[PDB]
Amino acid sequence: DPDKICLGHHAVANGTIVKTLTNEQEEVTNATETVESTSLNRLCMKGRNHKDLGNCHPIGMLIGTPACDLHLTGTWDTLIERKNAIAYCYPGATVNEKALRQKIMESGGISKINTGFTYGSSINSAGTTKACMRNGGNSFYAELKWLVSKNKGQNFPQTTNTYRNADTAEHLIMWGIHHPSSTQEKNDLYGTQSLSISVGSSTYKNSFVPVVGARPQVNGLSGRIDFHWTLVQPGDKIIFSHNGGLIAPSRVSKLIGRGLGIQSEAPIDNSCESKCFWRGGSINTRLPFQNLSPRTVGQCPKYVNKKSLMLATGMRNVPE
Amino acid sequence: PDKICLGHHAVANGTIVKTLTNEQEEVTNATETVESTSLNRLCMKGRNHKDLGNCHPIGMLIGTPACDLHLTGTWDTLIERKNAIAYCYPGATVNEKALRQKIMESGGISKINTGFTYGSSINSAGTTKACMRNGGNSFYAELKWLVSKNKGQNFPQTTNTYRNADTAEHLIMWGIHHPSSTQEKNDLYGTQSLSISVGSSTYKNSFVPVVGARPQVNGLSGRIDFHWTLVQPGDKIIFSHNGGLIAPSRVSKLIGRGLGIQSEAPIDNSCESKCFWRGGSINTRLPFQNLSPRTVGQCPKYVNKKSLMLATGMRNVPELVQ
Amino acid sequence: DPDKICLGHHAVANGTIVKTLTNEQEEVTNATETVESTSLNRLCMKGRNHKDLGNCHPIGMLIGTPACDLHLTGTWDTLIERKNAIAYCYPGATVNEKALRQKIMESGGISKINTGFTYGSSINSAGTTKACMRNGGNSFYAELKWLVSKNKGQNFPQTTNTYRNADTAEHLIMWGIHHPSSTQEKNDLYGTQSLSISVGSSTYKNSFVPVVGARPQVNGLSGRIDFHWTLVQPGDKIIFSHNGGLIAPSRVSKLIGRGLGIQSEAPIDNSCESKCFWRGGSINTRLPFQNLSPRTVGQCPKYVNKKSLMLATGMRNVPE
Amino acid sequence: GLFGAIAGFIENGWEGMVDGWYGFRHQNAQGTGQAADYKSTQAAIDQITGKLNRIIKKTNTEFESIESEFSEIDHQIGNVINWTKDSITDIWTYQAELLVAMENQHTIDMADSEMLNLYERVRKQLRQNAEEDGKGCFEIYHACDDSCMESIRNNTYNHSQYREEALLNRLNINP
Amino acid sequence: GLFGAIAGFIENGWEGMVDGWYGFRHQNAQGTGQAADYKSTQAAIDQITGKLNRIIKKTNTEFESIESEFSEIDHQIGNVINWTKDSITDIWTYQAELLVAMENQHTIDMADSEMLNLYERVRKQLRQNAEEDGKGCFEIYHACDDSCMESIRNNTYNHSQYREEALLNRLN
Amino acid sequence: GLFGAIAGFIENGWEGMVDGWYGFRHQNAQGTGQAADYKSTQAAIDQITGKLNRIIKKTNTEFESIESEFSEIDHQIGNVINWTKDSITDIWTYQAELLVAMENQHTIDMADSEMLNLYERVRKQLRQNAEEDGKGCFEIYHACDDSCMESIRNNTYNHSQYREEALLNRLNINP
Ligand SMILES: CC(=O)N[C@@H]1[C@@H](O)[C@H](O[C@@H]2O[C@H](CO[C@]3(C(=O)O)C[C@H](O)[C@@H](NC(C)=O)[C@H]([C@H](O)[C@H](O)CO)O3)[C@H](O)[C@H](O)[C@H]2O)[C@@H](CO)O[C@H]1O
Ligand SMILES: CC(=O)N[C@@H]1[C@@H](O)[C@H](O[C@@H]2O[C@H](CO[C@]3(C(=O)O)C[C@H](O)[C@@H](NC(C)=O)[C@H]([C@H](O)[C@H](O)CO)O3)[C@H](O)[C@H](O)[C@H]2O)[C@@H](CO)O[C@H]1O
Ligand SMILES: CC(=O)N[C@@H]1[C@@H](O)[C@H](O[C@@H]2O[C@H](CO[C@]3(C(=O)O)C[C@H](O)[C@@H](NC(C)=O)[C@H]([C@H](O)[C@H](O)CO)O3)[C@H](O)[C@H](O)[C@H]2O)[C@@H](CO)O[C@H]1O
Ligand SMILES: *[C@@H]1O[C@H](CO)[C@@H](O)[C@H](O)[C@H]1NC(C)=O
Ligand SMILES: *[C@@H]1O[C@H](CO)[C@@H](O)[C@H](O)[C@H]1NC(C)=O
Ligand SMILES: *[C@@H]1O[C@H](CO)[C@@H](O)[C@H](O)[C@H]1NC(C)=O
């Protein structure tokens, strides 16, 4: 007999399940995902002066490995390192290698400056190897010189070379030490004398001795060349004194500015933008969390160990 | 008129909890969220465990007498004890912290023969009173102390090569003996300049015995220091030496993964646990604990808090008391 | 017609904006700041036995650089290091310097104990240098002695010096190795013989060879003195065997207790107290957060990347 | 739930109401009808939009690599990095779970409160002219045509206009 | 409190009610009685059970040792570990404190709301046959015997049967 | 808001109420009145004071330096420290933002609830002697002088005293 007005709310046939403080299976009218599960399988490089190193390892840029010939100098805001990239054509390693790679991958460019080092007539400064091929022939690291005695068996002469940093910014200098595979090889290259290399600046001091020892062949070679580095401050000199075994710098490096270093397997895409990168590519999500990888670089969502986390965007669903 | 009254329960003695707005809120009931108690024992039920006792992990690789029952084996849990013995002869391992952690993360050790043999002018059976085994002078079981057979004569230029014929990396260890004096150095290895070179495809180093004056440790000024590297599958490692090398008779292979525990608490096989610390085991369902920040396994998170009571009931509003 | 009673709440003319879960600009009657933005430009040292090192570098306290003459011993609960502090008057450096500096800055004092080292008639133990001036005269590190041959050009004698720790606590012993600038200099100071320094305890051993190498002048000097250190355990001996190049300790150190190391440029103020310090001074706030610096020491508010975070202390403001 | 309306004294929702979150169904001599309420709907939507604006975002902090993808890391430093990264991941995973659980509880209860606030507005509007049936409806004790129903929905219903009629039907009282 | 019933218009709790969290007491011409309410009690308990299931749990992450108990650590890395561990402890201590404080606030207010929801259910059942006294009771303006009182508790009370009697008594 | 009173059915606040947070205004033959309610005001203030006591504090943990202000640091350890510190900063910035957002929401809604609880207390006191106007006021259907108004504020109002008078006026049957 009385007229009626009824208050109510909407519902949907199929609601979405969310978790609350008191209920693991609460049905609501709608929800939205907060953990990103999808990645773009490209490196989104739009708006970035980027350098893809390909098979060139960052350290190879400083010493001049043949794979790095197109990457000896340049500028960039983003530097991309790839898997199985080549640093050492000749067998060996760099001392304090991880710190050096990190420094290069934090830079925004490299320039090169001549050392001006010269060598007397009894030194062959153009030593080459089958391990470092360039332009169809035996070659060597482009930024270094393999010094040996010109006459086989003769004592390599006592030599002293100085690099002065005439710039207003710090330079990075690298050199190598050759470690022969046998006494006969050592004698042939540098003579029978006791070998010693010393390096000295205002901020750095060290000495090195070529170690002769039997080793397995790596790419047909039992010899090793190990690399060392330091920073030369503005106005300072660094002095090399040596009588056989030094792989001497013909140029030094200057790392310029800052950039973002990326280690990734994903191909580059110049038509899209991103701020967040990982091994598998780019993450362009607006969501606060992601479950792709704990290893990311740039401005990224936080990694969580969750497949899904649904945020309610509606009331409790109470269907008819 | 007639009446019906709505109400709620209460208790005479409530429990105090903290809320957003009140540090002393009385509720009908509450339950603890921070675990304060530990079992003073290592709960090893359902675990193929190894208690090392007085054997130090590094001693398993070199074969210190204290480790004779732990030269090989498999385990999912490895227990290290305080004051465990690694070195019978005075000395130390270079990069020892990384080595110990590798062993304590492993699920077992296997041993593989190096096949190192020596000519007639080498005495490969050097021993010391510092390393006693079965009531007699002995040495690290996995290594050999090489000296000149004839006292004072130059130890011969020698080459030994280990090939890794396995599909997994092997851990090779060796020692360098540092004599107590020039006369002792001359007696063992001769008057020649000594040099030990070690070279693989991935590793290179050189060593020289030193004879500088140093104090006695249990009557001995000599030192044997240990060095190690990983030999990759299919690679070989070459030792070139003329006196001072303590050479490996076996190499090690670390197998799988396991949980390393450092504790003085006794083993208990009748109970299980997934969380351990120095003082024993933490078996709790609670999300937090205040026993120690140093724990291993699957543990509640450490908090600097004696108690955090979670309310499991309404506000307690008791009846009036005179 | 009827009498009326109305329920209501207060409001203010000037409300404050705060952020809620659902509203970025919610006006409330009052609010208070949770992030501290201001700092006192002073080191608040009331209730602290403190040492301001000034021009003295912590390592200089152990070796006795002239700048540290008034900081060779003492006790403190707070140690203050300043910018451009001097450790090395003579050119050189300390091996494992970072760990040593941190040990000193974590300590609550330094005591000095005599080594008792004596030298025979063919050693001059009073070597000095223009690099380490005191009162206008050539001097040397207070806690060490520069040993040279008494007769110029003669072979420095094969010498032994032994320090025994007679205390119940570990002692910190330092020594130097001199690296000459030329062969002529090396010959004049120590003789033409091959130089070797060995150091041996129950827990430590090492050997050192003075290196003669060309290197640039630092304050007119191409020579270097590099420092090394170890801990001598209670009851143990440490033996120095040397024939030229050792810079030998006249005292050893004992670090006492614990203290708070502060690195700051701000002046001392003994009138006020604080538990939290940074480069720019002290943070005496009661607030839970601060935006001054992520690098702080002591008991501090947590650093946040926010200018302001206002906590509501009142209801919604609904003006008339 | 907290405010007792949604999944409470309101038995169920209306799948047929597609133009709003809250609304009215009526019954009079002319027939039946349905209409959404704009103000309550928009109050709920604006609050959820506010939550989304705050939650759907990342930090502007630029992070660099401390773990090599294609090379070996130091064993001591690598274990510290692994412990730290796993500890940080446990914190963010926990914080994420707590955020969304707390926000979902609040969203559901907020929506419940807006239903109740609409119900309360209508109750006070109708004053002595209607009674609550306990299921979210008001039984109106006077003839209330489509214009009258519209005045209730538009918040322009004047109770004084119908009071005499309503009290006669409710209580059998003449003035 | 938030919903105004528990520690609000309900003066105090009933220590004698041991078979439930919420319930009824009545007084009529025949006598008095007490009975617990199942649905409201179970609603509160189920929500608290849900919190406990969510909170009483640890992470599945397996941690290994980065600090040696029986041997020395490196001084530089040791200080970094000490700083990191203490920072992590401060985060977890803070999060634990906030979690329990927030959950306790919500538990108390949830319990308050279930008291109010029961009260409101009874108010709407009784319709125009009763009036609120402001203390959590309803004064019923017709004879309501033990069977009538049971029908209120059982949610089967039909107001229309008693309306004429109740309105006569309310108005006179 | 959640409880529907502040920025809800109460149109606005009173800038002229400076002696409390909640209160009463009235009108009768004797005059116009205003008075703050002590109990509701203090309930709100005590809860806010409780929050401030919990929030306005720092940890007792003593931290030492792991980054040199005036000298160089190692490259790899420095990168790990930079990553760790920035990760910790992101956690605390997030926690601080969430804390204050959550606390502010609760403070506003708590204040709303105290207003509603006062309103509900008055509604139940007045019983059948008054009617709600929908704006937070009660129209009282008997002469209610200053002592009567004070009894409402005090919770000593006796509805039975005025019920006969009130019902005659409410039903419009006053002889
Ligand atoms: C060409 C030469 O100088 N000597 C002849 C040897 O090459 C040859 O022994 C073979 O040497 C092979 C490696 O050859 C190079 C290389 O790396 O390609 C040749 C380079 O010219 C030489 N470079 C320099 C600056 O000396 C380089 C170098 O000596 C070593 O890398 C140092 O470790 O070696 C390879 O090792 C073969 O296994 C080996 O047989 C001998 C014997 O035929 O004759 C030499 O005249
Ligand atoms: C000729 C004479 O009168 N010598 C006196 C010695 O009795 C004595 O010299 C000490 O002798 C020590 C011998 O101990 C071992 C050991 O470690 O147990 C014996 C081992 O067989 C020997 N092993 C090998 C492979 O040579 C081992 C080894 O030489 C050293 O450990 C190497 O450092 O020594 C030992 O050689 C002491 O270093 C040595 O001082 C001393 C009293 O100390 O008086 C001599 O006059
Ligand atoms: C033995 C001596 O004192 N000889 C004097 C020469 O050194 C000097 O030549 C100048 O020497 C300058 C550096 O002089 C010192 C110094 O550092 O101040 C002088 C110290 O007495 C000496 N100390 C010791 C213990 O030998 C010290 C030391 O030899 C070196 O530092 C080791 O590297 O050197 C500077 O090098 C000038 O460039 C140089 O001309 C001349 C006087 O001018 O003769 C001697 O008096
Ligand atoms: C750190 O974690 C990675 C990924 O699980 C693992 O491969 C590596 O062995 C760990 N590092 C160390 C030093 O154990
Ligand atoms: C760490 O951050 C500081 C401050 O931004 C910077 O100076 C330094 O270069 C960073 N460390 C490394 C190793 O890059
Ligand atoms: C109200 O309370 C005040 C203060 O206790 C008292 O003086 C006054 O007489 C009371 N009035 C009534 C009507 O209850």
Side-chain angles (χ1 to χ4, degrees), chain E residues 63 65-71 75:
Chain E
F63 289 92
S65 180
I66 59 165
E67 287 186 307
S68 192
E69 294 288 350
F70 310 128
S71 72
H75 211 268

Side-chain angles (χ1 to χ4, degrees), chain B residues 2-9 18 20-21 97 262 278 285 297-298 301 305 309 311 315 317 319, chain E residues 13-15 21 23 25 27 56 63 68-69 93 97 100 104-105 108 136-138 140 144:
Chain B
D2 296 345
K3 57 193 293 195
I4 188 160
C5 290
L6 282 295
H8 58 89
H9 74 160
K18 299 187 179 180
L20 298 173
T21 58
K97 301 178 210 299
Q262 283 181 313
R278 195 202 183 89
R285 303 258 283 115
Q298 296 180 353
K301 297 294 182 192
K305 204 75 170 178
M309 299 300 291
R315 267 196 183 95
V317 193
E319 295 169 15
Chain E
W14 297 332
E15 294 175 36
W21 285 28
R25 285 181 178 174
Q27 188 181 354
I56 307 302
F63 289 92
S68 192
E69 294 288 350
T93 306
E97 286 171 339
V100 181
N104 290 351
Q105 196 76 53
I108 284 159
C137 310
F138 298 91
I140 300 159
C144 188

Side-chain angles (χ1 to χ4, degrees), chain C residues 2-11 19 22 258 263 279 295 298-299 305-306 310 312 316 318 320, chain F residues 13-15 21 23 25-27 58 63-64 67-69 93 97 100 104-105 108 136-138 140 144:
Chain C
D3 295 340
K4 187 156 71 167
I5 188 163
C6 290
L7 281 294
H9 58 88
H10 74 162
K19 293 172 181 188
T22 57
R258 295 290 266 92
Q263 284 178 316
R279 195 198 181 91
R295 308 189 306 284
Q299 298 177 38
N305 294 323
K306 288 300 289 282
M310 300 301 292
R316 274 195 175 95
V318 193
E320 303 182 51
Chain F
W14 298 329
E15 292 175 43
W21 284 28
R25 284 181 176 176
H26 75 248
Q27 185 64 60
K58 57 174 174 188
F63 291 93
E64 296 187 310
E67 272 186 304
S68 193
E69 294 286 343
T93 304
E97 284 180 322
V100 180
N104 292 350
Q105 194 73 63
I108 282 157
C137 306
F138 297 91
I140 303 162
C144 184

Side-chain angles (χ1 to χ4, degrees), chain B residues 89 123 125-131 137 145-147 151 177-180 184 188-189 216 219-223:
Chain B
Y89 194 85
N123 175 13
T127 58
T128 171
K129 194 97 206 311
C131 302
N137 287 22
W145 194 341
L146 316 180
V147 298
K151 187 189 286 191
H177 176 235
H178 301 288
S180 59
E184 188 176 274
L188 303 177
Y189 316 115
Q216 295 177 330
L220 298 177
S221 285
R223 305 286 183 264

Side-chain angles (χ1 to χ4, degrees), chain C residues 90 127-130 138 146 148 178 185 189 220-221 223:
Chain C
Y90 195 85
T128 58
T129 173
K130 73 187 187 178
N138 291 3
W146 196 338
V148 298
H178 178 236
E185 186 182 271
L189 303 181
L221 298 169

